[PDB]
Amino acid sequence: YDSFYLSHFKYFLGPNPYLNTGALVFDFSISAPSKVLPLEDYHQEISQRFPQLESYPLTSYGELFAQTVAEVNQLEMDLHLNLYSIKDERIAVQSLDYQTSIEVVDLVWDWWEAITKDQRFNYQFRLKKAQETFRFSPYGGPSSYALIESAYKRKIPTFYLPEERLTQYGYGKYQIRGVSTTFNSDSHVDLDFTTVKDDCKGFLANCGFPVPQGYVYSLREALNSAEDLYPVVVKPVIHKGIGVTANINDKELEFAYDRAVDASPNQRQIIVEKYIPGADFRLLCVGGKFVAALERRPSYVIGDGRSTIYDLIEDENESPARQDTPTSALSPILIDKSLENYLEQQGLSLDSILERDRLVYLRKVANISAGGVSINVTPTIHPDNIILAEEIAQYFHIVCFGIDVISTDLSRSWKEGDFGIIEINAAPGIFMHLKPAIGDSIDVPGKILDYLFVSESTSRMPIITFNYLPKQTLLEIVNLVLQSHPHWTVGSICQDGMWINKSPKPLPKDYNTGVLTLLRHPKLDLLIAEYSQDIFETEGMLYEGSDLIILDEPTETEKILARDLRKEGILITKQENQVLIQRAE
Numbered sequence: 001y002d003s004f005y006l007s008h009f010k011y012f013l014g015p016n017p018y019l020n021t022g023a024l025v026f027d028f029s030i031s032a033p034s035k036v037l038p039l040e041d042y043h044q045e046i047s048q049r050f051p052q053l054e055s056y057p058l059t060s061y062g063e064l065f066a067q068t069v070a071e072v073n074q075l076e077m078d079l080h081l082n083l084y085s086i087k088d089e090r091i092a093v094q095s096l097d098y099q100t101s102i103e104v105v106d107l108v109w110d111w112w113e114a115i116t117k118d119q120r121f122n123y124q125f126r127l128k129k130a131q132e133t134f135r136f137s138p139y140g141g142p143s144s145y146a147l148i149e150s151a152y153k154r155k156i157p158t159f160y161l162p163e164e165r166l167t168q169y170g171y172g173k174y175q176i177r178g179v180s181t182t183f184n185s186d187s188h189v190d191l192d193f194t195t196v197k198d199d200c201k202g203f204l205a206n207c208g209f210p211v212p213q214g215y216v217y218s219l220r221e222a223l224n225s226a227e228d229l230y231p232v233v234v235k236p237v238i239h240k241g242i243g244v245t246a247n248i249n250d251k252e253l254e255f256a257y258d259r260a261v262d263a264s265p266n267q268r269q270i271i272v273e274k275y276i277p278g279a280d281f282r283l284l285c286v287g288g289k290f291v292a293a294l295e296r297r298p299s300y301v302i303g304d305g306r307s308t309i310y311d312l313i314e315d316e317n318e319s320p321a322r323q324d325t326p327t328s329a330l331s332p333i334l335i336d337k338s339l340e341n342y343l344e345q346q347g348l349s350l351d352s353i354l355e356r357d358r359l360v361y362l363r364k365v366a367n368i369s370a371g372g373v374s375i376n377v378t379p380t381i382h383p384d385n386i387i388l389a390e391e392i393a394q395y396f397h398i399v400c401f402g403i404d405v406i407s408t409d410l411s412r413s414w415k416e417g418d419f420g421i422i423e424i425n426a427a428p429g430i431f432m433h434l435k436p437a438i439g440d441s442i443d444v445p446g447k448i449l450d451y452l453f454v455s456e457s458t459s460r461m462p463i464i465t466f467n468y469l470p471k472q473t474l475l476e477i478v479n480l481v482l483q484s485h486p487h488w489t490v491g492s493i494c495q496d497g498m499w500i501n502k503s504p505k506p507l508p509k510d511y512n513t514g515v516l517t518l519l520r521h522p523k524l525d526l527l528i529a530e531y532s533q534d535i536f537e538t539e540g541m542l543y544e545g546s547d548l549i550i551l552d553e554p555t556e557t558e559k560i561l562a563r564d565l566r567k568e569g570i571l572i573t574k575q576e577n578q579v580l581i582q583r584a585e
Contacts, residue, residue: 003116004061005031006109008090011098012540013512014159017560018085018092021544024101025092028062036116039064045115049123066091069108073101075131076325077142080149096148097137103130131326138167142327142431144180150445156459157544161520169452170459171543172524173489176452182427183452187397194396194426204421209392212420214273222257223250225272232256233273236264241338241365245345247275276420278408280366281377283385284428284444285393285401287451290386292433292442293410295375296366299333303354309343310350313362321437322371330437333371338363374432376439377410384413392421400448402428462526465546467558469530471496478502481526491518494530511535512542519543533557548572 008027012018018025030036042064047053050071058064066084070093073081083094095101107126114121138160139145144167151158156169161177166184169176177184182191194200205211215225226232226248233246234256243263245256253272261268284292301312313333316322322332333339335350339362343349346360354360366372385407393401402425408418430444453459464477474492481490482501492499493514497507500521508514512535518527519542531541533555545564551573554561562571571582 001109001113003032003036004109004112005029006105011095014541015544015564016540017537017557018090019083019094020564022095023092024095024098024105025090026105028065028089028091030061042112042115062086062089062091065108065112066093069093069105072104072108075127075134077327079145080152096139097134100130100134100137103133135326141180143429146431146434146445147448150443150449154449156449156453159519159542168520171519172461172521172527174456174459174461175520175522180427181400181430181448183399186399190396190398191426194424200424204392209388210414210420212273212276212422214271216270216272217268219254219257222253222270222272226253231275233275234260235271236260236267237269237271238264238267244364247277276406276418278406278418281405281407281410282428283389283403283405284430284433285389286444286447287399288390288393290389291444291447293378293381294433294436295377295410296368297373297375298361298363298366299371299373300359300361301354303356303358303360305353305356308351308353309348309360327431327435329435330373331369331371333362336370338367368432373438374436376436376442378442380411382411382413384415385410388414396426398426399451400428400430401426461524462547463543464526464528464548464550465561466530466550466552467532467554467561468552469494474499474528475502477528485525488525489521489523490526490528491521491524492528493518495532510539512539515542531561536561
């Protein structure tokens, strides 16, 4: 690091003096002014990678750096992190994860050293590293991320509860907590039950649902399944298509039994079911109501009499539709054990030429992340299939509920017969519904939040903040509030201690842990909290904005608190003996 230099790094979870949200903050400077002579050349190489920057004015080295980092922070997942603040060469960039954000800044720093010196910067490698780091942050998983992005645009506060490993949505008594598509209202019993395939299938069958019928330790038992009142499916109890043979007479079945057993020998514990032809569809209900349906089509190649499967896969992977980005709608076809096994089962291999117009599926079970195709088929679903989904969902107190079915045509009513329910997913992913390879997206994250907060006009209780709040003042205010609202829970925190309705509680060493405790309180009607400069510049603010802000002889840093004032909030300021009210708007 000879050309440019970064120092004085600070990370804030929430709003701080530089940004109104969480951020990584650092000081930008130049070590070698004689080497970093161009500004335009940095602009050009960077804008070539990020052409949207050609719309920006070229000002300082610091601002260009900040912009570069802000763009890089999006990685390739369009994360809503393209936000920066620069003043006096101090750069703040929006940050979801401390470790990830540092990696990004180092990436850009090393990149600029390379731009200055010998170029040849391995951007892809460094980015992939950052992407992987991000993936193990609490927001790394795209179904969790989508909910955050949605909560942001919906103005529902979110923060992370590290002892619970949950995201909290909303404040105080309005709170929802959750992990991904699973939430704290979801019933333990009801969830547990969906992990038991046999009892779950039995129960659904008894409710008149189209559950496939089935009967195995020995091949003799496998045979009995097919014999007693038909083509079958053979899978071991223990999966994901491993050892799976389907559309099976006696000889085919002896073979299929062996397949399942050899694949999983410790589970010799074999499942033999009547075969249902058709595509694999996911039916999703949210809040008990159907929201989306999606087909998961295995990837495939078409013959030509000229070229091998390997060649056909490579040609298909040149399609611009195939992207490596973890959150692409469609991955390049990847070659793994599952693909090779499925070809073997067809008497095919990679080095095999297919006849003109022959279609060959590469996997039995689509893996979207490895090249399968996600199709939004919602607009064509038969109303009876919508109803089926809802009639199943109504029995489980689970906010997000997925049903995996097989059908030859989802536009035909299940009553027609080429239809059956294979699996229940009590905490389904939703990303693929937001980003299908084919068809319109469905804002499922949106629908989830809409349902969760359907009953309330707000996701958050009122917050009062002060730059200075001595115990005396705090308690007088608490007293008045309770006189008007004696049934309320009022959480109050300042440097002098913390109280709930007059009852003192120990103050944690981390100020914001105390604040967290209050936000997390399920009955909280009102939060009152101090953020003196000592804290604002050290831990930062934990919640996103106040309804009432009070500045008693504030420092210039303390005055910044005023930025995060809710629409129609009030800013009270005291200087000498005068007090201003200033309704926000």
